[PDB]
Amino acid sequence: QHYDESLLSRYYPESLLKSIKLAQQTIPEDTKFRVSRNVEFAPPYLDDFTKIHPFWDYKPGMPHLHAQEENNNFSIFRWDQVQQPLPGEGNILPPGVSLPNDGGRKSKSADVAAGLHKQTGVDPDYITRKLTMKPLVMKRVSNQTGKGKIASFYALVVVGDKNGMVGLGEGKSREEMSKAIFKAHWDAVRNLKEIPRYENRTIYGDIDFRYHGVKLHLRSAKPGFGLRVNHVIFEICECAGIKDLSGKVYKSRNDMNIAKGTIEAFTKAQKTLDEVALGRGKKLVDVRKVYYSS
């Protein structure tokens, strides 16, 4: 289409009007333009080509194959910065990717909390604020293969809220011990269980429990007695919220099997007074508690 100078003079710069006038006197109005399917001269988008893009066009003053300035008339005298910054926002961050501005600030507890919430539905706040994690076993194991000995890091950890909820988790990693502990912490939260506690301080009576080769003899204790037990059992009691306990381990004292045996004993070897009362149809009275009641 041929347009009058008035219309074209309200959209295009004066410097380009003469070229438009000459083209409208050389190309007849009845020209039937054909599309080339061999050579693509024009870009894949529409452009009047009246403005120089700061990125998609050659930089004015920069030397290049098609620079029209004389070699003594270039205007780039500083070379410490990139001449043509990326267009638009200034980045090419893929959709769904985040710029790693800060590195090394993640909290392993928050990383465990986010993953478990997405995989199991547990509350992230409880994991990151209410739970305490304590490593119990940290060693290196090895497998003999045709290529050679392959070492692995093994971590056994216990987590708990100090208010009845405790869990045991194990983790393995061929790379580093930190990865093994992360997996163990992840596993421990998934294995969280509630353990009965008498007066939220001790166990109900005494426990004689056999876990594989470990013989566990645990006795309930008076208030203010403290924890007088194997060091492995001590850590578990701290996480679980047991304050008073006495005990002795016979036969095997393998740390791993003491920890698992203890967790099993606290759940499978205890019976609350309420459960005993209901099962037998009898009333069970704590004499010490009644003595100080109204």
């Binding site: 769904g96 919430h117 997405k118 995989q119 199991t120 539905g121």
Partner: protein, 342 residues
Amino acid sequence: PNNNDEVMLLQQKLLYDEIRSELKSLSQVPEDEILPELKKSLEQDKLSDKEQQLEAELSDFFRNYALLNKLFDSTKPYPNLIPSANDKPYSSQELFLRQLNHSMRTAKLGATISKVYYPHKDIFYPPLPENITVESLMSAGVHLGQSTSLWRSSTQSYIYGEYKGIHIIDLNQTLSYLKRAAKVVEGVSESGGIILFLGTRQGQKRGLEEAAKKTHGYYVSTRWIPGTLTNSTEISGIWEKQEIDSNDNPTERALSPNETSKQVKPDLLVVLNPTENRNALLEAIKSRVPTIAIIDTDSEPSLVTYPIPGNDDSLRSVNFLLGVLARAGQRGLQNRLARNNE
């Protein structure tokens, strides 16, 4: 009385075929035969006032609905039937429609059928849990347990006796367990929970699909992927979730990528063949998902929250028990949609 109306159309339809047939006849004739003779006539003819009327009325009528028109935009049953001529015999398609007419009216004259079992009605017309009797359960074969040689003695309390080398399940207990299980399905449905129906024995798909449809639930008939519940992010994260209102209508709200990766755990799992789905049962236990299952004499009752003692090998027995549970879910769904209306 009004047949003429249709006759008027057919007349035009016949005329249309005639016009088209001879339009194609003139498409073969060479132009040299028609064109020069036609033009010569006009050279020997003089237009009249009336002739000119159509000289421009047709030019516009053809410059309006043929050239300057939009080529595109931005009898209801069997509408593609080609009726045969009134003298010609019925076509194959017409005979099919003629037979369908007979099937609706005449084909069922003479007697009605009562007290006869139709297999499809177990799926589409399941009874309500309160109307189930021992007779109905027995008619479906629910009492037929496994061979006494395959007995899992942990089922001893469900057994009524042994007969013909198999253990007979006590249907009095089956009925009580079934009613309890049905109430659970109804409760979960009325609460808006996700009910998954799992059955992987051949032929169960039809029952499973309808059960899910009438409870607005879900089903799996092919294979339970080990880890579907415990490893859900690696198996089911890619599939699409949606938000729905209290009427179970899609809200259409786009979901944040955070909400579309979260595990979507079933609120209740129904297992038709638990002996072949140990994986699913153990995952349900690990995931604290209550489960219902049909427990045959060789099946472990303690692996499920609500066992239903019954034959799990017959499709009739399974579809009978599934149908009852599915209708119980439907009633819960209908009671939830009703409380929203009022």
